[PDB]
DNA sequence: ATCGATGTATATATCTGACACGTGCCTGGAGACTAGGGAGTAATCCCCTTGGCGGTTAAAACGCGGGGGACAGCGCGTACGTGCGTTTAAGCGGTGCTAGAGCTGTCTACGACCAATTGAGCGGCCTCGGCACCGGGATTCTGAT
DNA sequence: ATCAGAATCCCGGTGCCGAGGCCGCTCAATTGGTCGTAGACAGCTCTAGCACCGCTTAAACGCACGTACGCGCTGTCCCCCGCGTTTTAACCGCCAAGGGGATTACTCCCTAGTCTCCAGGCACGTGTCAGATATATACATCGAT
């Protein structure tokens, strides 16, 4: 029997570093490295959007939630940039619904 | 029928799943209801973010005139670029050595 | 069975080796066992929490995941192990 | 006979050990160090192989790390050579209270 | 500069 | 109209001082500091608890999970007596409910 | 018909509130789930820590020949005891000021 | 209408002060503006968040409330103002 | 005249602002401080009264504990004398400064 | 000793 | 400068095992739909924020004199680096086995939801005594003689 | 040692406004019950952790030598302290206007939940070429002269 079905990152960091470097691999212990990195700012941001709704007495996450996590967590110019493309790929997926 | 099935990263223009992060967002009892848009806006900064790191990585990789990048050229990419290094200040890379940097009152006198 | 005087098998070498690739030139003769009760006070603060995972998973064996979570709850977050 | 003077293996010993990714502590020695701590938290403990390599990894980081703070407290001092007061003083101010 |  | 009630932990703060000094008071200012305080650590133990749980791939928070994020919360002899202090109330809870 | 309502507080033996705790860890987004002894358990834990706190930083007002509590006197309490200084270390604790303490070298000689 | 040079109402008798109780003995002339440029850093980072929060409540008015999230944030928490 | 040696008011200096704990700073100057850094990042803030002193409150117990790192960075050079070269180091080992 |  | 020897970087050829890819499967994401309550928002109250002024006087700013600390030089001696001949045990590989990690199936003890009922504890009000202030005397450090 | 001066400490007294107690009410904790699914747990299996042997040789060890670094001392110069005078503006008590924080009521738009597919993503197997080893030697640079 093949063994549990245990979920990653690494088709989509792939996916990412071949727009990037198309002609440039990864080695598995770098993917690794990179599934830790996705994992641990994904904890961070949804950390911190779930203090921004509870100290809001808000139910719900919201992408404004996620936007003001982003201006915290992200410093300097990094912060610019990644809010420009979630507002980016936000107002992309409503126009497509 | 049914449409055809298109995947939300497809409709936000994105590689990373925006239908796994908005089920990791649900499952990780981050708030009792989790907004359409939060999934697209969060798998969109990760994409950015990973995007980052490889192009940095991917240079040192060249630079060392090397296909595959390994550990060490993730180490080499966040700590010389400044943003990166403070947002990754506190994370232990592993092999991934340290920059090279030799404190100038130990070099040699001419 | 029993393990006893470990510690010594930090030996001078390895933490010079340390050292220089800290980028230290020159080391007095003092460093190597104010060295080794660093590094021991280090080893135990985290193991004490990576134990401390371990029996609350009622597990017999100490996993990588273990010593991760113990490492970020130092504030030391590892990558490359899982997590 | 040939003779470096003092100092100049030592850069060249530094300039090796910042190119390396390589774990510079003896494995088993490490090994048995790790196995001989936890045998107080919990008798019987197995590891991971990759249990003692996260701790190698993070040990070797750590310490690694606190040389260089040793070495910027050494060079405060007018000194080259690092001494105990630089640890203590270097792991006092980042408030481990040495 | 900073990436896309 | 009156406003609205707003929670705090003072009143056992008090109940707890006038067992251990019967004959002190508390100021306002220390009282405030003393709510911050059980707040701080109320967060901090239901948090790791929550990881604890998560790490384990339990829906529930039991017990168990605040015991162990005592001993990984508390310095030492602090674990050691805030575990036996935990301990005896949930058996005597358990024998009178 | 019903019974008296008896609070889980008393029935554990505790100051502090078992109800109002139980409530924050299910209201709190921690767990899908609040097992019926997690409230008693971390309301015990609270309630020490509190006594614990306020037994120091009493006997720091009976030596300030105070009747009240101050916030000096938790900072006192706090800093001169090994452990709550451990676990209240990033803590910065307002009108608190801080330990008398002179280092050696600067004091005069004689 | 804006504000400019604040930065000079941090006196050198209150760093003194600030230095005395540091247990600080004897002060080079030289620190005065050494810890100003330390203390506006410290507060912008502190300032910064403390607005991020003010905005997302969408509200006019920085709350204690979001200088006590904002030091928290960056480990610094403070006790006394709510929270 | 009397004269006091030099040192000799510092230490009764620190021994009574190290009985103290009112805060250090002059209020007034401070907001205005606080004012002008928050119009760069919105303009016209409103601002709670305990808002201004939290951030006092953080502000001198912060640059109170730089200052006794400071101190041992100076006494570890062999000096009694703070330097910027000291607040410097200590800011470095902190990891606040690279 | 510690508190109770 | 010069020599020369040490050791590092650059070329080339062999090899191999890691990753890049393809396939078969199934799990979990997507499509369509309903229910209902979280959040938007509009209208209002009134808290508390900003702003301005006039007095006082605490604190800041300034100048000055000179004490003692910073720090540049120098001397010396012993602690450290460099080297190499000897010893150790790490590392490799191979092998054997069984502890226990991981999984599946079944049950029921437990916790979530719910409605009814109550009193815990909150807001507001008032009182008085713990602490703030202060003026006078005690005494203890400081430093000069 | 002794003495005069400054400073801090201690004491008795006045008084005020914050802490403690009380009231009363309202909403959140309790009681009693049902439901259903989380997880206790028993049984199985096959991963991988441990133990062991034994050979090679990389690394650790220990001992010699000497040099360059630590640091101890001294001398000089000027920076900082202490402190007396003048100036500033912090503080604070007061008055005022108002902005906008903090509620309400309403209601609709959004998300949770459900079912039904079905194709994206995983585990697995395979092939080959990027990188690791090895040998050679061109080039750097160290340091004795």
Same mark, same amino acid.
């Given at each position: 029997?093949?063994?549990?079905?245990?979920?990653?990152?690494?088709?989509?960091?792939?996916?990412?570093?071949?727009?990037?470097?198309?002609?440039?691999?990864?080695?598995?212990?770098?993917?690794?490295?990179?599934?830790?990195?996705?994992?641990?700012?994904?904890?961070?941001?949804?950390?911190?959007?779930?203090?921004?709704?509870?100290?809001?007495?808000?139910?719900?996450?919201?992408? /404004?939630?996620?936007?003001?996590?982003?201006?915290?967590? $992200?410093?300097?110019?990094?912060?610019?940039?990644?809010?420009?493309?979630?507002?980016?790929?936000?107002?992309?997926?409503?126009?497509?619904? | 029928?049914?449409?055809?099935?298109?995947?939300?990263?497809?409709?936000?223009?994105?590689?990373?799943?925006?239908?796994?992060?908005?089920?990791?967002?649900?499952?990780?009892?981050?708030?009792?209801?989790?907004?359409?848009?939060?999934?697209?806006? $969060?798998?969109?900064?990760?994409?950015?973010?990973?995007?980052?790191?490889?192009?940095?990585? @991917?240079?040192?990789?060249?630079?060392?005139?090397?296909?595959?990048?390994?550990?060490?050229?993730?180490?080499?990419?966040?700590?010389?670029?400044?943003?990166?290094?403070?947002?990754?200040? /506190?994370?232990?890379?592993?092999? @991934?050595?340290?920059?090279?940097?030799?404190?100038?009152?130990?070099?040699?006198?001419? | 069975?029993?393990?006893?005087?470990?510690?010594?098998?930090?030996?001078?070498?390895?933490?010079? /080796?340390?050292?220089?690739?800290?980028?230290?030139?020159?080391?007095? @003769? $003092?460093?190597?066992?104010?060295?080794?009760?660093?590094?021991?006070?280090?080893?135990?603060?985290?193991?004490?929490?990576?134990?401390?995972?371990?029996?609350?998973?009622?597990?017999?064996?100490?996993?990588?995941?273990?010593?991760?979570?113990?490492?970020?709850?130092?504030?030391?977050?590892?990558?490359? *192990?899982?997590? | 006979?040939?003779?470096?003077?003092?100092?100049?293996?030592?850069?060249?010993?530094?300039?090796?050990?910042?190119?390396?990714?390589?774990?510079?502590?003896?494995?088993?020695?490490?090994?048995?160090?790790?196995?001989?701590?936890?045998?107080?938290?919990?008798?019987?403990?197995? *590891?991971?192989?990759?249990?003692?390599?996260?701790?190698?990894?993070?040990?070797?980081?750590?310490?690694?790390?606190?040389?260089?703070?040793?070495?910027?407290?050494?060079?405060?001092?007018?000194?080259?050579?690092?001494?105990?007061?630089?640890?203590?003083?270097?792991?006092?101010?980042?408030?481990?209270?040495? | 500069? /900073?990436?896309?």
């Amino acid at each position: 029997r093949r063994k549990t079905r245990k979920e990653s990152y690494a088709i989509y960091v792939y996916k990412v570093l071949k727009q990037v470097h198309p002609d440039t691999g990864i080695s598995s212990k770098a993917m690794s490295i990179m599934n830790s990195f996705v994992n641990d700012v994904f904890e961070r941001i949804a950390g911190e959007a779930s203090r921004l709704a509870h100290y809001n007495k808000r139910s719900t996450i919201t992408s /404004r939630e996620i936007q003001t996590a982003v201006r915290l967590l $992200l410093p300097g110019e990094l912060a610019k940039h990644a809010v420009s493309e979630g507002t980016k790929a936000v107002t992309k997926y409503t126009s497509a619904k | 029928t049914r449409a055809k099935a298109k995947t939300r990263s497809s409709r936000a223009g994105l590689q990373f799943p925006v239908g796994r992060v908005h089920r990791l967002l649900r499952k990780g009892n981050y708030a009792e209801r989790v907004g359409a848009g939060a999934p697209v806006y $969060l798998a969109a900064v990760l994409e950015y973010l990973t995007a980052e790191i490889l192009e940095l990585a @991917g240079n040192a990789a060249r630079d060392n005139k090397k296909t595959r990048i390994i550990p060490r050229h993730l180490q080499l990419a966040v700590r010389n670029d400044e943003e990166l290094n403070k947002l990754l200040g /506190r994370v232990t890379i592993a092999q @991934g050595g340290v920059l090279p940097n030799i404190q100038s009152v130990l070099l040699p006198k001419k | 069975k029993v393990l006893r005087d470990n510690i010594q098998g930090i030996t001078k070498p390895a933490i010079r /080796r340390l050292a220089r690739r800290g980028g230290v030139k020159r080391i007095s @003769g $003092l460093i190597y066992e104010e060295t080794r009760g660093v590094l021991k006070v280090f080893l135990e603060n985290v193991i004490r929490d990576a134990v401390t995972y371990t029996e609350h998973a009622k597990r017999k064996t100490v996993t990588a995941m273990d010593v991760v979570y113990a490492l970020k709850r130092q504030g030391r977050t590892l990558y490359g *192990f899982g997590g | 006979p040939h003779r470096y003077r003092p100092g100049t293996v030592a850069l060249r010993e530094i300039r090796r050990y910042q190119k390396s990714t390589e774990l510079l502590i003896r494995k088993l020695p490490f090994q048995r160090l790790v196995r001989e701590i936890a045998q107080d938290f919990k008798t019987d403990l197995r *590891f991971q192989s990759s249990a003692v390599m996260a701790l190698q990894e993070a040990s070797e980081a750590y310490l690694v790390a606190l040389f260089e703070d040793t070495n910027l407290a050494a060079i405060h001092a007018k000194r080259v050579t690092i001494m105990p007061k630089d640890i203590q003083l270097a792991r006092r101010i980042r408030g481990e209270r040495a | 500069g /900073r990436s896309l």
